[PDB]
Amino acid sequence: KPMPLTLVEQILAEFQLQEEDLKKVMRRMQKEMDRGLRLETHEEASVKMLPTYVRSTPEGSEVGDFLSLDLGGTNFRVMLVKVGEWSVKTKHQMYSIPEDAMTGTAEMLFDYISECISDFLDKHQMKHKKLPLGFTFNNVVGLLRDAIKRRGDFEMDVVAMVNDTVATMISCYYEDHQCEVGMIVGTGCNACYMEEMQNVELVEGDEGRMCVNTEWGAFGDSGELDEFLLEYDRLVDESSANPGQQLYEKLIGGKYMGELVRLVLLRLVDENLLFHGEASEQLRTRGAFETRFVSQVESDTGDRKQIYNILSTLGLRPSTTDCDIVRRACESVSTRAAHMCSAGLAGVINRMRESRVMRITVGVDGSVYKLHPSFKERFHASVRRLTPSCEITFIESEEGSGRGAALVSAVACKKACMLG
Numbered sequence: 001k002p003m004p005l006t007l008v009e010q011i012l013a014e015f016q017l018q019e020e021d022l023k024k025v026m027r028r029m030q031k032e033m034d035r036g037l038r039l040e041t042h043e044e045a046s047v048k049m050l051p052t053y054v055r056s057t058p059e060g061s062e063v064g065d066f067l068s069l070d071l072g073g074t075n076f077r078v079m080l081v082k083v084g085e086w087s088v089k090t091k092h093q094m095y096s097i098p099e100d101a102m103t104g105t106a107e108m109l110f111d112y113i114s115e116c117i118s119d120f121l122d123k124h125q126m127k128h129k130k131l132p133l134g135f136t137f138n139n140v141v142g143l144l145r146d147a148i149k150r151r152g153d154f155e156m157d158v159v160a161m162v163n164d165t166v167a168t169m170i171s172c173y174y175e176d177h178q179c180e181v182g183m184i185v186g187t188g189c190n191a192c193y194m195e196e197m198q199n200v201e202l203v204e205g206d207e208g209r210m211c212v213n214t215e216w217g218a219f220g221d222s223g224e225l226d227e228f229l230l231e232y233d234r235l236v237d238e239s240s241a242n243p244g245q246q247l248y249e250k251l252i253g254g255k256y257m258g259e260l261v262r263l264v265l266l267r268l269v270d271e272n273l274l275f276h277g278e279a280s281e282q283l284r285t286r287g288a289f290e291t292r293f294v295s296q297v298e299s300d301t302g303d304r305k306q307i308y309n310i311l312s313t314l315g316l317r318p319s320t321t322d323c324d325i326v327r328r329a330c331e332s333v334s335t336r337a338a339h340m341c342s343a344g345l346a347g348v349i350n351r352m353r354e355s356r357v358m359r360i361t362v363g364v365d366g367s368v369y370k371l372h373p374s375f376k377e378r379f380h381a382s383v384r385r386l387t388p389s390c391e392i393t394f395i396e397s398e399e400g401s402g403r404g405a406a407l408v409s410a411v412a413c414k415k416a417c418m419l420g
């Protein structure tokens with residue numbers, strides 16, 4: 001690797017977070033999580049710590065058979081699941097989303113999904129059963145319900161979905177029974193974890209554990225992050241749909257990562273350190289630097305082809321130095337995101353540790369975590385540094401055979417049943 005530019009590195013150094021900084025964010029997160037959990041403070045808490053009603057014990061035992069509907073991009077799976085004494089047996093069919101039912105209404109698409117569900121039920125002689133249906137991957141539940149009603153020929157309880165963090169935890173638990181945390185680092189960022197029932201003040205009872213959905217993206221409301229915000233973060237915040245809100249998620253999620261990078265590049269441009277002080281019109285356009293471009297730049301093999309390709313698409317004619325500066329800018333933003341995210345997770349893991357040496361599996365999903373080079377590794381290394389006396393295993397949500405997803409639907413249907 002070459003000797004970096006001093007003046008560029010001084011700007012990029014703004015993004016560094018020291019261990020003392022990360023510990024400070026973590027402690028602050030821990031106090032907000034405490035507020036969220038307590039009856040007295042829950043309403044005013046910015047970090048809601050929502051009880052998910054997913055308990056550490058097998059509940060809703062009368063739910064034996066159910067439908068699982070896995071909705072993807074251009075198709076969907078209809079799966080019949082039987083749960084026994086767990087013995088998760090599945091059968092399924094794949095269906096293709098109609099090619100024209102992407103011009104017409106959301107309502108017409110669900111009539112088609114309904115029809116496929118009916119076909120599956122006919123095939124396995126299950127049309128009469130009043131099966132619950134769990135959805136895997138917001139108001140799709142409402143749309144499916146309406147479309148089944150619209151049909152009348154079979155009866156069904158489309159159950160509430162679980163939050164994506166909870167689905168991540170559950171599906172990962174299927175492959176590793178030590179999984180007690182689910183985390184998403186995608187467009188948004190959130191975590192759920194198995195909390196001691198005594199600490200879940202919003203639910204009566206002291207026995208076992210319940211999954212708590214932190215909704216930690218809202219952290220930062222009270223200025224918990226203000227000392228870590230850079231100019232780019234303030235600009236992103238001011239231009240967002242919700243200024244002053246979701247400050248934490250704004251530092252981490254893919255929704256704004258590309259925008260952060262874009263703003264860094266324009267700073268460098270204006271300091272005459274990049275593109276010889278000349279930005280293109282696409283670069284000057286809000287949202288033009290896509291988050292995927294950050295991972296693409298970071299994927300560059302060393303030849304600068306991927307970077308040149310991205311930057312040329314933005315109407316730039318970058319030198320090799322320009323390409324290298326953009327890379328480092330993408331890395332600084334990504335690394336800062338991984339560090340901020342690690343302080344949140346460390347906060348959860350440390351709290352869990354008090355509440356009992358601790359071995360724990362963390363289930364993780366999301367485009368940023370899965371697809372950004374070195375995000376996950378920097379994230380792991382940082383989390384581990386902040387959690388001494390914890391051994392943390394990280395696993396990804398991987399579709400496999402659809403059994404983790406069957407389990408998600410099982411739990412969601414059982415929870416619904418348990419909740420009347």
Ligand SMILES: O=C(Nc1nccs1)[C@H](CC1CCCCC1)n1ccc(S(=O)(=O)C2CCCC2)cc1=O
Binds near residue numbers: 411
């Ligand atoms: O069903 C559950 N919880 C529910 N709340 C409400 C309705 S249903 C939980 C959810 C998990 C708990 C821990 C983290 C991930 C999810 N659940 C799911 C499978 C098994 S199990 O069947 O694997 C068992 C049988 C032998 C040992 C474990 C045990 C269990 O408690």
Ligand SMILES: OC[C@H]1O[C@H](O)[C@H](O)[C@@H](O)[C@@H]1O
Binds near residue numbers: 188190249
């Ligand atoms: O998708 C990750 C997360 O994005 C946003 O933070 C949503 O509020 C949250 O519920 C979800 O878990």
